[PDB]
Amino acid sequence: SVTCPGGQSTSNSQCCVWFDVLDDLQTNFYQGSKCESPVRKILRIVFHDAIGFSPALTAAGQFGGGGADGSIIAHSNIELAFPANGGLTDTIEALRAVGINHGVSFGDLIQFATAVGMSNCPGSPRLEFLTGRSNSSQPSPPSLIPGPGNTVTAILDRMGDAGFSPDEVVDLLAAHSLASQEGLNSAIFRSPLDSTPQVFDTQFYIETLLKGTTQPGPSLGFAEELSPFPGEFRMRSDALLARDSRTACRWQSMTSSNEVMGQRYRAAMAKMSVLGFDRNALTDCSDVIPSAVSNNAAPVIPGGLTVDDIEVSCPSEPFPEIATASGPLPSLAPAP
Numbered sequence: 445s446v447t448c449p450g451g452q453s454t455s456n457s458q459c460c461v462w463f464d465v466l467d468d469l470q471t472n473f474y475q476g477s478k479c480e481s482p483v484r485k486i487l488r489i490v491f492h493d494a495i496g497f498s499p500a501l502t503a504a505g506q507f508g509g510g511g512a513d514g515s516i517i518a519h520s521n522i523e524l525a526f527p528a529n530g531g532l533t534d535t536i537e538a539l540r541a542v543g544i545n546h547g548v549s550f551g552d553l554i555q556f557a558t559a560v561g562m563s564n565c566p567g568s569p570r571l572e573f574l575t576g577r578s579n580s581s582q583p584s585p586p587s588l589i590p591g592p593g594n595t596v597t598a599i600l601d602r603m604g605d606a607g608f609s610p611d612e613v614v615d616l617l618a619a620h621s622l623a624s625q626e627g628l629n630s631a632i633f634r635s636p637l638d639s640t641p642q643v644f645d646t647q648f649y650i651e652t653l654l655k656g657t658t659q660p661g662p663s664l665g666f667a668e669e670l671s672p673f674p675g676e677f678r679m680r681s682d683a684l685l686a687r688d689s690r691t692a693c694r695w696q697s698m699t700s701s702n703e704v705m706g707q708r709y710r711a712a713m714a715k716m717s718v719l720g721f722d723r724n725a726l727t728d729c730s731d732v733i734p735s736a737v738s739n740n741a742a743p744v745i746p747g748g749l750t751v752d753d754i755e756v757s758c759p760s761e762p763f764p765e766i767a768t769a770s771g772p773l774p775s776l777a778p779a780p
């Protein structure tokens with residue numbers, strides 16, 4: 445049966461090399477299987493790699509990008525000069541070394557390191573993992589990565605061209621539940637985007653909907669909005685997407701069930717992992733990905749705030765009854 449040298453069982457012999465890069469990533473890149481900055485930086489990288497894909501550029505006779513091809517590593521010299529790719533160089537070099545040492549393609553390595561990093565974060569779904577993407581890539585065209593100062597129309601058009609519906613854009617944003625910022629306001633380095641930057645949960649959707657009350661740093665940084673409590677950072681595109689009529693009802697439905705959020709995110713990520721590829725030409729090695737520990741906490745409106753403090757923006761469905769916490773307002777420490 446396909447037994448790999450280490451004695452694990454898998455579906456196909458092409459999956460066996462991935463048990464070795466699992467060990468290396470967990471011990472080294474993830475510093476003992478932790479859910480800290482390397483996982484958050486890999487999640488920006490998989491998005492920035494895969495979104496360099498534009499059918500409208502191809503239609504106009506231009507190169508439109510190869511999608512999830514590892515071009516952000518193979519052509520980092522040109523892609524890391526793009527505005528959205530700051531604070532990624534160290535992570536890209538660590539990944540380059542693993543790819544070269546294990547003989548796997550860069551596009552596959554990024555997808556694999558995303559599924560493995562998320563498995564270290566409580567509450568995460570098991571992401572699908574496909575292997576076989578060609579290692580050959582051309583540099584991504586510029587201006588294909590949505591930025592935090594863009595309007596909701598600009599973001600939905602860019603994501604729509606890549607292939608995502610407005611609903612899938614909200615689903616994909618569940619990754620900001622494991623997030624902080626470093627380059628928008630350097631004065632409050634690693635300020636989290638929700639109160640549990642180490643748990644994949646619904647808190648990001650709940651807390652971006654809360655009324656912006658607090659300025660967390662000495663000044664406001666690029667595309668920064670008032671947040672609901674000390675230490676939390678709120679990005680303008682996230683504030684706008686939570687409130688815009690085209691995305692507000694899907695954003696609201698993501699607040700009460702970690703289970704629904706996880707399924708929707710896993711589906712949207714599987715679609716993003718094969719942009720520029722035919723998934724029927726890839727081999728499924730999903731059984732190499734381990735289970736994350738379960739998250740047993742329930743969704744809550746933190747620190748004494750109530751439903752009266754969230755700015756309900758979906759005019760059709762009433763806000764879900766979420767639990768409240770009898771606390772003083774929290775102050776978040778930097779994400780680890």
Ligand code: HEM
Binds near residue numbers: 487592628681
């Ligand atoms: C509407 C599109 C989105 C925009 C405009 C956006 C923008 C940003 C920006 C400006 C940052 C802060 C980076 C920094 O200063 O360090 C950030 C962080 C982050 N984003 Fe996004 N994002 C979006 C979608 C996504 C998606 C789809 C994913 C991946 C599936 C993602 C994953 C992350 C993660 C995990 C971080 C945290 C980085 C860290 O803590 O080091 N983002 N995003």
Ligand SMILES: *[C@@H]1O[C@H](CO)[C@@H](O[C@@H]2O[C@H](CO)[C@@H](O)[C@H](O)[C@H]2NC(C)=O)[C@H](O)[C@H]1NC(C)=O
Binds near residue numbers: 518519540
């Ligand atoms: C994937 O392609 C890249 C080239 O784009 C290869 O990367 C180079 O690998 C050699 C040795 O294998 C290194 O000395 C170079 O420094 C690498 N270049 C870059 C830009 O990183 C990589 O080896 C290829 N991988 C496979 C398995 O074919």
Ligand SMILES: [C-]#N
Binds near residue numbers: 488491
């Ligand atoms: C996010 N980039």
Ligand SMILES: [Ca+2]
Binds near residue numbers: 513
């Ligand atoms: Ca790419």
Ligand SMILES: [Ca+2]
Binds near residue numbers: 621638639642
């Ligand atoms: Ca969270």
